[PDB]
Amino acid sequence: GTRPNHTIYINNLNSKIKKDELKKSLHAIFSRFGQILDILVPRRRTPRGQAFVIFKEVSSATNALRSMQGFPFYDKPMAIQYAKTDR
RNA sequence: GCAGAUCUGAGCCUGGGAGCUCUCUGC
Ligand SMILES: [Mg+2]
Ligand SMILES: [Mg+2]
């Protein structure tokens, strides 16, 4: 179970992309919904196509989730959820 | 300790990946 907050968690991402390019791409797509504070691509033992996007306002996160839910991104559909704990 | 680093460092856990530890670099 989750509830809305500033951050959104995205998995099922193209792991063949460089971490740098993935950040710049996510910023260009999601910044349309509002102001972004930071994008976090954590380092894991294996590439698992995970990323976080932290907006300044929750409204930006709610609209970003609904809109890009399942929308293609680098030939793969995005699975988006809310973050467990606020950032 | 903070920050970063492996489809281009590594051992585990998991076996339907929001997990643990180590190592390297900078401070
Ligand atoms: Mg597995
Ligand atoms: Mg050290």
Numbering used by the authors: 5 to 91
Q: Which text from the study accompanies this structure?
A:
The viral trans-activator of transcription (Tat) protein uses an archetypal arginine-rich motif (ARM) to recruit the host positive transcription elongation factor b (pTEFb) complex onto the viral trans-activation response (TAR) RNA, leading to activation of HIV transcription. Using yeast display and multiple rounds of selection, a new class of TAR-binding proteins (TBPs) was identified that bind TAR with nanomolar affinity. Here, we present four co-crystal structures of lab-evolved TAR-binding proteins (TBPs) in complex with HIV-1 TAR. Although it was hypothesized originally that each TBP variant would recognize TAR using fundamentally different modes of binding, we demonstrated here that each TBP binds TAR using a conserved subset of arginine-to-guanine interactions within a lab-evolved β2-β3 loop.
Although TBP6.3 contains four arginines, this variant exhibited 8.5-fold weaker binding than TBP6.7, which has three β2-β3 loop arginines. This observation prompted us to investigate TBP6.9 because it is identical to TBP6.7, except that position 48 is replaced by arginine. Unexpectedly, ITC revealed that TBP6.9 bound to TAR with a KD of 3.0 ± 0.3 nm and ΔΔG° of −0.4 kcal mol−1, indicating a nearly equivalent interaction energy compared with TBP6.7 and a slightly more favorable Krel of 0.6. However, the TAR-TBP6.9 co-crystal instead revealed only a subtle variation of the fundamental set of interactions first observed for three-arginine recognition of TAR by TBP6.7. Specifically, the Arg-48 guanidinium group of TBP6.9 interacts with the backbone at the pro-Sp oxygen of Gua36 in a manner analogous to Gln-48 of TBP6.7; simultaneously, Arg-47, Arg-49, and Arg-52 retained interactions with conserved major-groove guanine bases (Figs. 2B and 3 (E and H)). Collectively, the ITC results reveal that placement of arginine at position 48 can be favorable in the context of existing arginines at positions 47, 49, and 52—as seen for TBP6.9. We chose this variant because it contains four arginines and represents the tightest TAR binder in our ITC analysis. A second interaction is also shared among TBP6.7, TBP6.9, and TBP6.6. Each protein makes a hydrogen bond between Oγ1 of Thr-50 and Nε of Arg-52, stabilizing a favorable arginine rotamer for guanine recognition (Figs. 2B and 3 (E and F) and Fig. S3B). Additionally, Lys-50 and Lys-51 of Tat make phosphate-specific backbone interactions with TAR, whereas Arg-55 interacts with the backbone of 7SK. Such contacts are similar to Arg-52 of TBP6.3 and Arg-48 of TBP6.9.
